Each structure stands twice: as C-alpha cells, then as structure tokens.
C-alpha cells in the first residue's frame, strides 16, 4: 500500500559477524516479545516450539539445551536471567522456573492468562503480566503467588503489557487501558494512577504497550502519539508531546531515543519535548527497537538489514545485511557483545 | 370498461314480522350523493 | 363402493366434555360461562340471546357423532335454561 | 434473423422462414 | 426551459406515443426538480402511467405527491385517480377474453379501492367525481360480497356446516343489500337443517318467505 | 490483519484442535472482523461443553487483540471448567392438561445419563409440540436444573402452563391472483369452526408445495384482536408462471409449408385443470394430440382425464391413432390408484425386411416374402391400463426429501388383435446430507419389462428404447440396445442411394446395422450429487441447480435366437451394461424448465454412438 525505500550509502565500517548458528525453527511470523539474554558469558535463547538453548557467548557453541514441549510448549515472554535462575513465560499461561547452571526445570506454575511479557526479578519476587490485565508477583523460591492486582482494558489491541519498571520497593506499569499505574511491590497496593492519552476515537485509538524511571523522573509513551514526563510519587505530568510508538525507547545522556509508530527515527532532550533531530530514510519501513552499542545506535528491520546510526545527528554510519530473512524482535547488547536473532531461529553475534 | 355501470340496484332487505335482522355493520356504508356528474366515457379525466 | 376412498377426518364446532359441562349452573353470568367453556362459535343473530355449543365428529367414514348444548339467557345476561342433546336422534 | 422480446416473459423470432413466438402463463 | 418539451408531451398525450411523452416528462422531472411546473409534471406522469398500465409507478407517484402536497386545491382528483389505480389491478385481459368470472380471486385489491373511494366521497362530497365514485362503490360492494358467497358455497360440499353458518352470518352483517346475500340464504337454511337445530331453521324459513318475490 | 491463531486457556477435557474444529472462524484452509462468527463460535463452544455434563461451565471473558500495523489478529477466550454431573430424574409439575402419562413418558431418561442441555431443550419442544397437537396454541414451558454439588448430580424441575384452547375463526388467503380460491381450499386439513392443531395446519404447507403451482407458502397464525381464544390462520403464496403457448411456422421453396404448435398448462386459467394440446404438419408426417385432466371430479379426490391422438408418416408407411380414458383416486394420505381403458388402431405398409420384425410377424401367422417390400399389416387393439403411485416429496420443482414411486402397466383385453402385457416402474429418492439442504444425494432408477400371451411376441412398435437426455446421458437418443439385422430387392430405392445390404446387389447375406430396434426389457439407474451454485446473482439463486452424475443402463432382447444367428452378437446377454458420467445443470426459466448436461461415455460397446453435449426440456422429476 506504500513504498518502502532503501538508502544508498557507504558502509563505513563493514561490521564483521563474529559467529552465527540456529536454534530450532524460531519465531517465524508470530509476533511476540521473545528475545535472547546474556549473562556470565552464556547466551540464552529459545524457540517458539519449546526448544531452549544456552550457548557459549564467544563462539556460539551449544553448552546446554532442553525441550519444554510435550502440543508445543509455545514458550514466550523472552528470557530473564537473574541470580541463579532463568524465568520463561508461555502462551498456555505456564511459567517455567529453571536454574542458570542446570536447565532442569526448578518448578512450573500457571498465572491464569497468557504471559506475553518479560518477567522481572527484583526484591525477591518475579513480576509477571498477563493479557487479561492481571498483574502477579510470584515468590522467587518456589513460584508461590504473593499478590495480584487487576486492571481493565478495551477490546481493541495487543499491547504486550510491557514489563514493570521497579524502584524503591514499588513498580510502575503501563496498562493497555492507556493509564500508567504505580503499585507497592510488597503488597500489590495501588499507589497512584495517571492517564497518558485520551481521544474521541476511543474505538480505534491504541493504548500503552515501557515506563523508564531515571533519578525519580518517569518517562512513558503511548502508541497514539502521546509521550509524557511524570512524577515518580504521583500522577503529575511535567510535559507532554504528541509522540509514541509500540517499540521500546532508550533514555541516556540527557537524551531520549525513539522509533516512532510510523518508523521515524527521533531524538529529544531529557528536560522537555524539544526535538534534537529526526531521520526519515527508514520511515514506513518496520523497525526494531534501538540499542546503544559502543556509542552508536543500532536498529534492524524486517528485511534483514542492520543500520548503524550516528547518535549525534542521526547520520547513517553503516548499512549492512546480515540475514535476509528479517528481524522482528528486540536486539540486545551487553559487556561489549551485540547479540541478535532473526525472525527465524538464527542467532548472530556481531 | 363500463361494466361498473351494469351493477344491479341495491334493493335492501326488509325485516320479517317478529324476528329482527342482524345489527347492521357500520362498515361499507355508502353516503347518499346527488349523482349529478358524468360517468364512464362521458367523463373527462384529463388533468386540470 | 366409495367406502374405499380416503376422506380426511372432519371436526366441527367447539370442544365439550363432561368435566366442563357438569360445572354449568343456572345463575352463572355470561362471563362465568364464557370463562368455563370458552367463546361460543354459534349464536342466534336474529335477536334471541342464546348460545349454541356443538361438538361434531365424522372420522373414518364412521357414523356421525354429535353432542349438542343450547344455553338460553335473559335480557340481563343471566342464564335461564339448559337444553342438552347427548346424541342425534 | 429478426427477433424481438416485446414484453417481459414474451419472446418472438422471425427467421425460408421459420417464425415462432412464445407467451407463458 | 420546460415550455417546449412540456407542450410536446401534452400533444403526445392528446394524440401520440405515450412512451415519448413519458420520456420527455421524466427528463423534465430530473432537469427541473423544483420548477414552476413540477407539480403539473408529476400529475401528468401519474396520468401517463395509468394510461400506459404502469400502475406500480402511478402508485409511487401518488404517494410521493401526497407526501409533498398533503393539502392541494385538486387533491380530490389525485384521490379519484388512486381509486381507479387500485381498481385497475383486479382485471386480467387473458381471463376476460375467455369470459371467466374472476370474482373468486384475491379480493384485497377491491377492498383497498373501496377504501380509497369511500374516503374520496366522504372527504369532498361536492366534488364532480362523486357520481362515478358512487357507481364504483356500488359495483365493488357486490364484488366483495360475491367472494364470500363462493366460500360459503364451497363449504357446503365438504360439510363444514359451522363454517357455513358463521360465513353467511358475516355476509348478512356486512352486505345486507346485495344479490349475493339473497341468494345465499338457502345455504344457511340447509346448514341449520343438516344439524338438528330446527328452532333456528324455522326462523330462516320465515326470513326467506318474508323476502320472497 | 488476518487471524493468526485461536488460543484456549484452561481447557483440559478437550484439545485445542478438537474445539477449534467446530468454529466457523478458521486460520487455515483467513477472515477478518467477523464479529458474528466470533459470537456464534462462543455460543457453539458453550453448547459443546454443556452437551458433556459440565453444568458449571462458564466463559469469563474474551479478547480480540490487533497486532501492530494491522498485520494480524489474536483471538483468546478464558475458560473455567467444572465437573460432570449425573441426572437423577425429572420432576414435572404445574397446570397439566390431564395427559400426564404422555408428558411424563416423553421426558423419561435412563438412569446414569449425563446432563445434556440439548436433551433439556428437546424435552421442552416435545412438550410444546404435544400440547400443540391437542389444541393448546400458546403453552409456557420452562425448566431449571437443581445442582447437587456434593453428589455431582442434577435434578431437573420442569414447569408447564398449558394456557387454554384456541379455535380457528376464519382461514383467509392472500397473494393468489389467478388461481381460483376453490383450489387453495381443497388442500387445508384444518377446518374452520373447530379446534386448532399445529399438526394439522402444518400439512397445508406440504400439500400446497406438492401441488407444484407456487414458489413459496408462508404460514401465519395471527391472533384475533379483542378475543381471548381465537386465531386467524393466513396463507400467503406467490404464483409461478405455469405453462406456455408455443407456435412456429416454416416456409420456403425447399422446405415447403409446415407448422408446429401447441399449448401446455398445468393450471388452465387457474381453474385446476391440466391441459395439453400439440400438433404439427409437414410434407411427410402429420401429428396431433389432445389431453385433459381434472384432478378433482368429486370433492373427495376422484380425478378424471383422457386423451386422443393421431399420427402418420410416409417414407415405410406408418399410420396410427387412438384414445384412452383414465380414472384415479387416493386411498390414503400418500398412495393413489389409477385404472382406465383405451383403444389403439394402427397400420404399417411397405415394411423394410428385418429379422426382428419378421419373427414377430411369423408368430401371428403372417408370411411376407423374403426381402419383398410389397407388404402390409393392420392392428386393432383394446387395452386396459393401470397404475399405482406413492409420493412423499417436499417440493414440486427441486425436491429435497422423500421418495417417489410410479408403477404402471397395461394388458390386452381378450379379443384384441395383439395379446400382451407391459410393466414399467420409475423410482427416485432424495436424501439430504446437510441441514441447509444445499447438499443432497439423488438416486433414480427405471425398470421395465414386457411380454406376450399365448406364445405371441409383443408388437415391435411397443418396444422399449433407452439413451437420451431423459434416461441415460451422453448417448445418441434411442441408440442403446440391439440393432436391426437385414435380409439380403425390388424397391424404388434399389437404383442408387439405398442401404447396400438391403439391395439386390449390395449383399447376398445378413448384416448388422446401426438402426436401433429397442427391446423387450430394460433397466436404467443414475446417481446425482446435488450441490449449491458456486456463484450466481441472488435473483436467480433459487431458480438453478447443479449436480454431478454417474449413469448406467442396459436394454436386451428376450427370445433372441442366438443359435440360428450365432455368427452375430448374441443380444440375449444382459451383461453389456452401458455406463457414462458427467455434469448437469437444471434451470427453471421464465419460459419453463431446461436441462443442460455434458457427459463422456467411458464404457461403450460395438455399435454404440456417442453425443456429449446435450440439453432438453425434461418435463420430468
């Protein structure tokens, strides 16, 4: 219905692929927040069918693997690695708690709803969201339920119930009804709520997906072009802009890095809605969320390209293809290693 | 056609001695009119 | 030998049964009788305030079966007479 | 090869000549 | 302007092809929807549709006119044409040709026509059209009574003697001055004699004798 | 933006695929924004669970979640399961009509059955239907299962209120413009002035549809205003253009002067009579036929009808004429009988010398000279006709249920020139295999046999023929079966252009031919698979039918002298069954029925002729 352009630019650095391998079938055309994680020089990744591997981060060698399938396991929610355990959700409402040193499942429980979100491990509890608006905290010891809260939602869209951001014993979550809420994590006690966006076109307008808290300042945005800066202990909004998307955003260096719902690349200041620059060469071409790696901004897209963006002005630093099958999920980086998985099982380290 | 001009005269029934005829329905009554106008082929039915 | 030609069974008139007619008494109002037996299908339209209750069946090319009840009311709507023919004769 | 359908549900054909027509009731 | 096309259509109506007059009038109806002649054009289309046997459109045009002209100095003409429009749907040229008596077919159209003419006669007693409407009403009253006669006659052959009695009583209540009731009365006498209800049969016999001639 | 998957959460008794298999929404061979199908699927899922005893089954919520950029839809339902409950019994109370023995009997269950919501609904309909048979028009029936959780059992409480009786005051008809009222009032089984029953009124719809005159019959039971216990039953019908007037005339310098004309109507000016007039003339053949049928001579169903016909052809020379009269009447709701008498006179002359014809002629005492065309014969036969029929079909144009049987035959009356008998049997059965009656299985068979009396052969012009668009599709009409065997003379054709074998020079021995003679016995059968129209404008959706078919049939010659003619194919062997297959379309056009078909005669024998693209005016089914 619309043209998808490509740039014609020099590949300044021709980034070298360090290794690649595949894990089973992979994600394919199913939209989910399934992504790898890296800890202790071990890369953890999973297939939608249920195959989960731990790989050697330096050469891609398989060091551990398990199958959680019987119907398939339908593993989802990504991989969260914290302390001695790895936690994975599922579309069957099951939550698998595995150990980091041994992939034998420590326990399995159910959360009464699809676990289509990233589990968060903090303050002794594992925080899991569900598509039904039920937010639940589990005991990190045996998976026991500690508390739940119940939110509402319109019958409209998939938002992913973006994972909570925790601070000072509480957490902030973005509800798919369009409200940001703060809850006390020791009890499940609601602290405050605030609305981000409203419209007369409530039937079609989309809602919140990932809140970020920096020095007590809350950043949040909704797909329906609404981005705000909020207080951490109240619903007070400091400033608002007509900005938002479904993808994650990065806050660092006193700057906010966004990828717009329309695939525009945008940067703003931390102290307000002031725009620093935009880039449109990828506009209307599905982009992944940004990652900051060795000082550069890196994004992928649906055709297998990776793009190295100069964080100063948005200037394109490099254009390279790694895997022509296309990227759908979040690229990740840590401790100098940039890891990414294609839309299929293939995992690359650049 | 003019077949409507051949209808038999509406010769009304009379009651017998004793028993009364059923109560006349109020429907299909025809008001008494003068009948002074034209009928059939003698009537000009063009628009005014 | 028309006896072999099929004829659909014919029902005529209102239904009557002993369980209902045994309840009728002189002194009932027209509303009470109409309630007990139901709306008459036949009456005298010629000025006599009377109702005719007729139960007629002719199934199977069999003999005619009929029970006849005649109810006579006064000008006030009060039943004054009952005439019940249990069979044709 | 002359023909006509002068009215709905009426058909005529003319066409040596083999003229024919149909009405249905 | 509509002047020349309308005048041409009028000459086509007086003598000529009614379909050309209709084509011209429809062109004027679409080209000048609100012009000074719009009402005359609508009245002429109603007439042309009646004359050309396009009765579904004469009915639609009449209802449109009535909605647009709930009051009009010549609305009695429109009602009179409505009555003729509905009475025209009773006849059938093919059934007519062979001399078949159509009285037993669906009578709903005759009742609709009757209602339209009754409203015409009652609403405008001084209209020049009430003489013809009176003749229409006299003819139609028998058109409707005869149908009930045919049903009453059919039931005496099957033996539904209760239906016969109630059907004729209904006729007697609604059509006391038609020929069909005077001819129907023996059907009631027979119905009251096949059942053992002689007390009522004598009443009927007295009615027949009183009106015999 | 299409649905990518359907997820079920909390299901343990059934698998995802088993439950999805009953939905109208599917993600595999996609649909979008189907709100009505989602609602239908949720109701279906609830009923599916209720049918297995899960009395506590509850659906807590559903979600429809659109993916980014309208790439797809996720559908999910939240399911809470209970347990399976046993039904302990049924307690019936309330204002019963005095027929508790039947009300209780209809609701009986066997101990140990699991609760089933559909059975409860059936029990309710079986009580409303029963009360609707004695004359209670508007009963109220309600039920509520009492749940005993400790014992995992239920007990059903049924509350009945019979209401009161209703009577029919008038039966009125609307919408018939041509058919006489006396036609519609012959088909009502519910009489005015008597108690109502729905089992009686519903038969009027079937009777009128079987008549075949109307496109639809819409019933109604409108209540009388201002009356506590009376109903006005009204039938609304729409008449189809029934029959046609066909005329054409031929003229030219090579064609000469000829004509063909006729009139065919199943309903004559709407009076219920069926008539048929046909005639045609040309320079070598004349034909005329007249028939009339009155379906109602008496009010109880006795019917009368008959016909006269004449024809002749000059080349052999063949002239015939005759008349017949038939009387018939019903003996119950579905069966009827016919019988009648007729007379047939004919003559033949200059008959071509053939073995099949002459064996018959010899059997009567005739002695034509070998290969001598100078010959003649005359026949005057008196015939007795009889027939039995059965008809339980639901419709007149495109049947969907029931079956039809037509057993007919005739015998010679002693003293006739010929002595013989002939019997035929048509059967057809419709079996629906879909609740919407769009997919139907249709089978048809035809059987027939004839023979003589006293050692005589049946006259050859009464023989059966098979093949053609009406009987076995794909063969040239009247070509299936034995062919004429010719004798080896002094004709007006011998000089040239004649049939060589039959000439003085062409042959001195017998030969086979392509000229069909039919035979003494036949059997034909076909199977059609009736399917919905792939696509057509709604206007014609109910006027067309499509089907696939497989046809077979065979005709064989009894008394074939296989020993005297051993050098030629033995026509006594019935096993040479002809088979074909193809596709057909039927259309009820404003001008009458048409049938179009294409077939391939995949199985054929020596002498068979093929014709693959056919259509006709069937006047059958």
Short mmCIF file of C-alpha atoms in Angstrom, two decimals, chain D residues 5 9-11 14-25, chain F residues 241-252 255 265 590-591:
data_model
loop_
_atom_site.label_atom_id
_atom_site.label_comp_id
_atom_site.label_asym_id
_atom_site.label_seq_id
_atom_site.Cartn_x
_atom_site.Cartn_y
_atom_site.Cartn_z
CA UNK D 5 -38.79 -9.51 -26.88
CA UNK D 9 -41.67 -13.19 -20.44
CA UNK D 10 -42.58 -12.86 -24.14
CA UNK D 11 -40.29 -13.86 -26.99
CA UNK D 14 -38.97 -14.21 -37.38
CA UNK D 15 -36.39 -16.38 -39.15
CA UNK D 16 -37.04 -19.92 -45.98
CA UNK D 17 -38.67 -18.53 -42.82
CA UNK D 18 -39.44 -20.29 -39.53
CA UNK D 19 -41.11 -17.56 -37.48
CA UNK D 20 -42.12 -18.51 -33.94
CA UNK D 21 -43.13 -16.84 -30.70
CA UNK D 22 -43.81 -17.71 -27.08
CA UNK D 23 -46.08 -16.49 -24.31
CA UNK D 24 -46.17 -18.25 -20.95
CA UNK D 25 -48.97 -18.32 -18.42
CA UNK F 241 -45.92 -18.55 -14.49
CA UNK F 242 -47.12 -22.10 -15.05
CA UNK F 243 -47.20 -23.06 -18.74
CA UNK F 244 -46.65 -21.85 -22.26
CA UNK F 245 -48.13 -21.26 -25.70
CA UNK F 246 -45.65 -22.37 -28.38
CA UNK F 247 -46.15 -21.67 -32.09
CA UNK F 248 -43.95 -21.66 -35.16
CA UNK F 249 -44.41 -21.97 -38.91
CA UNK F 250 -41.90 -22.97 -41.58
CA UNK F 251 -41.99 -21.90 -45.21
CA UNK F 252 -39.70 -21.89 -48.21
CA UNK F 255 -38.93 -26.51 -47.16
CA UNK F 265 -50.51 -25.77 -18.96
CA UNK F 590 -39.40 -17.77 -17.01
CA UNK F 591 -40.26 -19.84 -20.09
#
